[PDB]
Every structure is written in C-alpha cells, then in structure tokens.
Design a protein around this ligand. Structure first.
Ligand SMILES: C=CC(=O)N(C)CCOc1ccc(Cl)c(Oc2cc(Cl)cc(C#N)c2)c1
Lengths: 402, 519
C-alpha cells in the first residue's frame, strides 16, 4: 500500500549496462510480455531523460512451453544498498522443493524515486527502430531488494502453514521458496500442494532435491600389479593431496621408481611401500583439518570437464580447504553440447550453494569468454544469475578429481 | 485556427551538484552585432527564443560567421546524461517504393523544458558597449545542446507510434531531419499513405514540404536492388587510412587483408588489394523467406575471411576475422572464435544464427571437442571442401605405449649466468646432455622435450616434471611465437604415437635426472 524507502549505496550511480543482441523470437516474446505488463501497470514507458539500463532477455523454464522474461539485475544488485537469516537445517533435510514465487512481488509498489534505476530496453533487430524503453513500477523479479521488502508479507502468509507443519523448513532466496521436509516423498508432494493452495488463498500464485552423501573423499587405486606409470601417477596424486592432508608421504613409493624403467613395466611393491600406501589411505579417510565457513568471504566454485558428460566441481573459500566437492554426470538434452552441459552444471552448483549457505559462488569456468558469452543464455532456466570468470590454462589437477 | 496537439516536454535537470553556465561574452565587432540582432529578432518572432530580464545570472557565448552560433560547450558539460548502433544495409528488406520527407521544421518545433530554459541564456553585446546587451533564452531545443538529438528523435518516435501501429504494411526510418517511408503497395496506395502521414504530422503542427535513390547514408550507397560501400579507391603512392578504408571495404569486398598494413614504409605489397578494390562489388538485401548461410575460409597468418548469403554467389555481406593476440594458438580455436563473431553479428543484423559452412571435417571437429579440456560448441554447420582444410596436427596418447622407448627428460639453468643444460636418459640406456647459453629454466625444460622427440622412433613415451611444458602442450597449439615450441610441434607432427607423462620434481622418481641437467 505504501512504498518502502529505497536508495543506492553512497557514491554509486545507477547501472548503465549495455543490452546485448537478442534473436527475433526472443524479441517478439518480450514485446508480448511487456505489452501485457504495461496494461497491468507493472512497467511504464520512459523517456530520454533516463540514462540507466539493465540487460533483459527471455528464457523457457523446465516443463513449460511459455517464454519468460529475465532481467540481469547483477549490476543493480551490487549497487543497491544492503537491506537490514539462513537455516542450517535446510541442507540436512531429506528432501527440498523449490517454488517460484516471483509473481508475488508484483503486487507491491516500488519507491517512485528508485524506479528509474530499473530501466531496461527491448532491442530492435538491426538497430532499425529505437529500443522500447521501460522502467518498473512494482518490485521486479531478480532484484535483491524484492524479497527483502516483501519479507514482512511473506512471514504473514507462512505463519499459518508454519504453525500447522512445524517440521517443515522454509527458506526464501530471490524469487524462490525452498521448502524442505524430513518426511517421505509422498508426504512431501502433498504438503507442497497444501502450501501452494495456502498461498493461492492469500492470492499468491505458485506455478526435487536431496542432499549428497559433503567433500567427496580422495581415493587411491587398489591393484595387484602396478606398472611404473601407475606408480608415477599415484605419487603425483599423493604429492597433490599432501597440500591438503598433513602426513602424506611418498618416499617408499618413489623409491620403487628408482632407475630409468620402461613406463609399462610392472614393479612389485616392497612391504615398506604397501604400508606407506596404507598410511596414506587412512589419512585420506579422515576430514580436512580446520575447514570452516566465513560469511564475510566469497565462495569460489571450480568446474572441470572430465569427458563423456561428466563434470567435477569443488566449492571453497581458501585454496585446499574445500567446503563442498561433487560430480555432475547428467546430460539432459545435452549429450552433444558441452556448453549446455556446463550451463546446467553451473545452475545445479548454484542451487546447491543457495541451500547450504544462502548465497551464490563465483565460478571459474573451463571455457573461453567469447564462447560462453555467446551461448549460456540459450540454456539458462533460473531466475538468479551468479558471477563467473574464465580459465584459459589447463589445470594439471583435472584427473586427480577423476 | 485548427487546434494543434502539444508536444509533451521532456523533464531535464542539470548534473547533480553542478550549477548552470556562467561564461563571459566575447567582444564583438559592430557589423557582427547588427547581424545577430536581425537573426534573433526573427527567431523571437518565431518563438524559438525570448527576451529575458537581468535576474537570470547565466550566460552562454554567441558568435557570427550571417549565421548565429551559440557555443554550448559549457552547458553541455553541466547537463545531465540522456539515453543515447546504426543499421547495416544487409539487414534492410527491399520495398517497391521508398519516399523521403523533410521534418527539419519539427526540430525547432520541439519545446524545451521550462525550468531548464534559464540555463540557455545568451547575450548580444551592444554597440560600443554603451547600453546593456540584449538578453535571450531558448524555448526550443538549441542546435548544439547536449540533449537535442535524444529529445528530438524521442519526440518524433512518440508522434509516429500510432501511425506505424495502424499501418503495419509500411515502414518508417528516422535519420537526421528526414523520414524514410517504404512499402510494397501499388504506387497509388503508397502515395496515399504518404498523405495520411503528412495529415498525421499536421495534428502536431508539423509542416513537410512537397533525395532520389541511390541514397547516400553513413558511408553506403543504397539502391533499389543492391547496396555497396560509397566508392572506395585504393591510393597510388610512393611514400592507417588504408587500414580504415580496407576495413570499411572488407564488409562487402571479399578477401581484403590488413595484417601487414595493420603492422614507417616497409613490406605488404597483398597490399595492392586493387584487383578487387578496383572492380565494383555489391551486396543484396535480406529476404526473410530464404535461409541464411555463412561460409569461412582460412587465409593464413591468423587471418580468416567469410561470406554471408542466402543464394549462392549473391552475398548479403562479407567480413574478416583476425586471430587474437596470444603466445600459442591453433586453427580450430581460431575458427571457433570466428564462428562466435559471425554468430553475434548475424543476430544483430537479422535476428537469427546463420547456417555455417566450414572447412573442417565432421570427424575432425568431433575428435576435437570430445578431447578438449575446455567446453566448446559451434552452432549447426556442415563441412565444405575448400582447401586449406582445418585439421588436427597431432594427438597425444592417453595410456603409455607398450614397446616404445621411455625418455626421462630434464632441463635446468642458472639465473645469473644464463647457463643451463637439457637432456634425457631412457630405459635402453640412451642418454644425452646438451649445454646451453643464454637460457632459462623454462627454455631448458622445453629443449629437453625437443631432444627426446628428435632422438626417438615414431612411437615414444616422454616423462617430464615441467608443469610449464605440460601447460603449453595440453593447450594443443599448432603454431607458436617461440621457435622452440614450433620445433616441438613440428616433431610431434612426424611421430606416430606420443605419450607425455608428468611427475613431481625432486621426489625421487627415477630417470628424473635433475642432477645431469644441473651439473
Ligand atoms: C526502394 C528502395 C529500397 O527498397 N531500398 C533502398 C532497399 C531497402 O532499403 C530500405 C527499405 C525501406 C526503407 Cl524505409 C529504407 O529507408 C532507409 C533506411 C536507411 Cl537505414 C537509410 C536510409 C537513408 N538514407 C533510408 C530503406
């Protein structure tokens, strides 16, 4: 009813981000979507006195054949003033369901002075006509201040359902509700429908996740016959692991490699070497020492392409102190397209990271900037977008995660 | 008196914390002052300016050349920012008729925000400076003010929006003080619709009088059936401008090359370029009913050329791509990058990705992307058999080779003396150490691998501890800046099977002969 006061950070101006080129079908979808939002009053045409801009594009979520508008509010989010909690138990729940609650924000007006900062441009093919320029009147999807503002009304719609089901953990990140239950799968599917119906009673309209078994162990081969090459790779992996785990030792194993032998020759292990291997195995079973999470520091996610649709990743804040490692091997309409696979892996790792820590990591992508920047929007399906950078030098460590 | 619809003004404000301009008026001559007074009197009689009292404390200088020139550089420095990409002719769609209209009278018919007029004040000095100068402020967008182009085009666009919506069968393009209207209707109906547009512009009090293709626009020539760059003639000289004009010509003239001239007389002469830059070439216009095709050729030295077309031999446009500046590279990476650029340019100009025709075999591309450590992708494409074909020049083994000699290599160098050594020991007892001057650890680690490649059979296993060397070879270059790397590449091309294994240094792995190399 009454707009909440909102301002930018001190010394910062509104965003002025270039709109990137869209295909004709995406432009037409945005034209139809935006024409409808104008009629509903959610956006309004603006004039040349507004210099700000945020990129816009279009997507199709999963199991839907309807175009959807996504605004890349990353710059505005960075420049938007911090707004004055994360549940540690959502990660521990047996199952967690993710609900798009984006339409709820549109029922809330936006502070008139701030609207100019939500400006965006539907572009024209071939720069023929001028871009259609709009700004938001209501809380926009993907703005960080939209859940912060709507939060008071969200607690009001939740408290009835929450009192009725107190074993349900509920969490809100951007345009999504994360609802976790320790119940059985049939018990979950029903309660989520009950929560959506409860939302629909308050006017809210809502159009699968289970925790992994956190840091995957480093494992060493078990062979009856080691070649020279087998033992060279073992020593390489053990040397690498020694940066992470204290008492890894390679002396007895390296001693076998003494002399200049053929790479395919079988070397029998001495009894001192088998014990050293066994001591290193035991070391590797224990956890890394002194691994904590610091909410002041950024999360960093590294991804390696392992081939055949397999991808490894590690999340960490400090090198060799992994908070989470994983392996994504699903090719969903992607077995011929690396970039689609990478884009889906980035979205899964980001979701994992939202559940565990309630914020997105900074990705280090095994891909050239120009290829990634040309294609990722074609396969994007989430309402948030994380940050990324590009690795152009092949990490030696790729196989040690394979 | 027919009531004219008012043109809504655009609210304008100055930059935050900045006040209006206060520049001192330059002393003028007596005839200049008389000239300015006549001009401003007719402008005032027309509404463009208005006399102001002395409360207004702002001033912008004025000059005469008559013509009045108000120098708004200072007010522009203090005016807010405004929302600011030109069409490409190969994107235009042919029309049976295209009419041009003059809307220059509307520029001086777009009002200026009232609260901002005071900032536009200017003073005509008086004769012999014995009276107070005449004081005027603008009521319309001053030519030369910062916001005039953006506010003007924006005001016209709002005016034409209903007309373009009620007439989907025509097309309107705004450029400078002229409007371009085209359609595919019969010459009768098309001239009718032009009269409706003049009627519609009269509802805002805009007068249009009552160019002839080819149009000359932004360095192009636009004909009813073809387009081309405005005539480009290569220069004849004995002793940058040739770069820009060739880059400009490259968009239509296929095969322009600019590397050595992009690289102070020298040679270049390719730099003739006349062969084509002397015969006349034209591109066609876009037909949305036909498919869109892009074809790339390798030209050598990191250079690539491409044509975009819909029917064979009638190009919409052409272009080139230059390798990115780097230390190592290969042809597939370059071709990939060229594909990405043509992809983005095509989405700009036609709103879709072209179908690609590429000089690479399907099997070559599959081997590449399945084994490349990065993710990579090119959109739908088919092989075209136009030499030189892009190919993989070597492929390292995944497993050690049985029966192939194992070379343990190492190099090392002294930071002060620049003296080092490179060499190998193998399982057959073969051995070599070469002494080197003016070298580094990095170069000796490469040279050791090179020696093993030179002195081994067609199949060989090589063991190094150089993370630096593995970093380079795992990038799969086919060409380098370093002649060492290029010699390793040339050796790798001649082998049948190469297996490269890495071990950690100074951990007691045998054969890893840091002692011979550090002697
Ligand atoms: C009859 C001509 C024709 O069919 N031609 C030129 C090719 C298609 O070309 C068009 C079509 C429609 C318009 Cl409305 C247009 O008008 C413009 C566009 C631009 Cl980008 C610049 C100028 C100028 N200065 C005029 C050209």
């Amino acid at each position: 009813i009454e707009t909440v006061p909102v301002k930018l950070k001190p010394g910062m101006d509104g965003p002025k981000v270039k709109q990137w080129p869209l295909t004709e079908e995406k432009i037409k979808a945005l034209v139809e979507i935006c024409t409808e939002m104008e009629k509903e009053g959610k956006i309004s045409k603006i004039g040349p006195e507004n210099p700000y801009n945020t990129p816009v594009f279009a997507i199709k979520k999963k199991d839907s054949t309807k175009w959807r508008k996504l605004v890349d509010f990353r710059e505005l989010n960075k420049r938007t003033q911090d707004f004055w909690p994360h549940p540690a138990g959502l990660k521990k729940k047996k199952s967690v369901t993710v609900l798009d609650v984006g339409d709820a924000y549109f029922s809330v007006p936006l502070d008139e002075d701030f609207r100019k900062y939500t400006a965006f441009t539907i572009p024209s093919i071939n720069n023929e006509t001028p871009g259609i320029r709009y700004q938001y009147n209501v809380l926009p999807q993907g703005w960080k201040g939209s859940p912060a503002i709507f939060q008071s009304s969200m607690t009001k719609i939740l408290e009835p359902f929450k009192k009725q089901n107190p074993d349900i953990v509920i969490y809100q990140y951007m345009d999504d509700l994360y609802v976790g239950s320790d119940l059985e799968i049939g018990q979950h599917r029903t309660k989520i429908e009950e929560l959506r119906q409860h939302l629909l009673r308050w006017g809210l309209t809502t159009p699968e996740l289970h925790p992994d078994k956190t840091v995957q162990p480093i494992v060493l081969p078990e062979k009856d016959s080691w070649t020279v090459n087998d033992i060279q790779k073992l020593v390489g992996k053990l040397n690498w692991a020694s940066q992470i785990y204290p008492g890894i030792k390679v002396r007895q194993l390296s001693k076998l490699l003494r002399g200049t032998k053929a790479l395919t020759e079988v070397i029998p292990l001495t009894e001192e070497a088998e014990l050293e291997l066994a001591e290193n195995r035991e070391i590797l079973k224990e956890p890394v020492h002194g691994v904590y999470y610091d909410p002041s520091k950024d999360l960093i996610a590294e991804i390696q392409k392992q081939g055949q649709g397999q991808w490894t990743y590690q999340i960490y804040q400090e090198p060799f102190k992994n908070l989470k490692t994983g392996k994504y091997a699903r090719m969903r309409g992607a077995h011929t397209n690396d970039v689609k696979q990478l884009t889906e892996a980035v979205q899964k790792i980001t979701t994992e990271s939202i559940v565990i820590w309630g914020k997105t990591p900074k990705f280090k992508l095994p891909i050239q900037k120009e290829t990634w920047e040309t294609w990722w929007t074609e396969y994007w399906q989430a309402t948030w977008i994380p940050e990324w950078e590009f690795v152009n030098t092949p990490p030696l460590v790729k196989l040690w995660y394979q | 008196m027919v009531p004219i619809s008012p043109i809504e003004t655009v609210p304008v404000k100055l930059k935050p914390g900045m006040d209006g301009p206060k520049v001192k008026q330059w002393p003028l001559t007596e005839e200049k002052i008389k000239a300015l007074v006549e001009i401003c009197t007719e402008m005032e009689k027309e509404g463009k300016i208005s006399k102001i009292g002395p409360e207004n404390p702002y001033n912008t200088p004025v000059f005469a050349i008559w013509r009045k020139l108000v120098d708004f550089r200072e007010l522009n420095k203090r005016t807010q920012d405004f929302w600011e990409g030109i069409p490409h002719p190969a994107g235009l769609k042919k029309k049976k008729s295209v009419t041009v209209l003059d809307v220059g009278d509307a520029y001086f018919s777009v009002p200026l925000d009232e609260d901002f007029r005071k900032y536009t004040a200017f003073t005509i000095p008086s004769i012999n400076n014995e009276t107070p100068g005449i004081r005027y402020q603008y009521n319309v967008l001053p030519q030369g003010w910062k916001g005039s182009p953006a506010i003007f085009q924006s005001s016209m666009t709002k005016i034409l929006e209903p007309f373009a919506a009620q007439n989907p069968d025509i097309v309107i393009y705004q450029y400078m003080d002229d409007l371009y209207v085209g359609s595919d209707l019969e010459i009768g109906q098309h001239r009718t619709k032009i009269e409706e547009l003049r009627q519609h512009l009269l509802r805002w009090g805009l007068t249009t009088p009552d160019k002839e293709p080819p149009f000359l626009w932004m360095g192009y020539e636009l004909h009813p059936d073809k387009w081309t760059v405005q005539p480009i003639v290569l220069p004849e000289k004995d002793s940058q401008k040739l770069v820009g004009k060739l880059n400009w010509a490259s968009q239509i003239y296929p095969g322009i090359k600019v590397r050595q001239l992009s690289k102070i007389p020298l040679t270049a002469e390719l730099a003739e370029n006349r062969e084509i830059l002397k015969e006349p070439v034209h591109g066609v216009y876009y037909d949305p009913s036909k498919d869109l095709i892009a074809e790339i050729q390798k030209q050598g030295q990191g250079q690539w050329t491409y044509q975009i077309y819909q029917e064979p031999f009638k190009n919409l446009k052409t272009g080139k791509y230059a390798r990115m500046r780097g230390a190592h590279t290969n042809d597939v990476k370059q071709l990939t990058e060229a594909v990405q650029k043509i992809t983005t340019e095509s989405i700009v100009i036609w709103g879709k990705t072209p179908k690609f025709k590429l000089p690479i075999q399907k099997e070559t591309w599959e081997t590449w992307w399945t084994e490349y450590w990065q993710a990579t992708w090119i959109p739908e494409w088919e092989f075209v058999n136009t030499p030189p074909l892009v190919k993989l020049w070597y492929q390292l083994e995944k497993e050690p080779i049985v029966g192939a000699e194992t070379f343990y290599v190492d190099g090392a160098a002294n930071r002060e003396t620049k003296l080092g050594k490179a060499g190998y020991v193998t399982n057959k007892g073969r051995q070599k150490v070469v002494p080197l001057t003016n070298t580094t650890n990095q170069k000796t680690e490469l040279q050791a691998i090179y020696l093993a490649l030179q002195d081994s059979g067609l199949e060989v296993n090589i063991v190094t501890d150089s993370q630096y060397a593995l970093g380079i070879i795992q990038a799969q270059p086919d060409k380098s800046e370093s002649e060492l790397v290029n010699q390793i590449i040339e050796q790798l091309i001649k082998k049948e099977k190469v297996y490269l294994a890495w071990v950690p240094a100074h951990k007691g792995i045998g054969g890893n002969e840091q002692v011979d190399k550090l002697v």
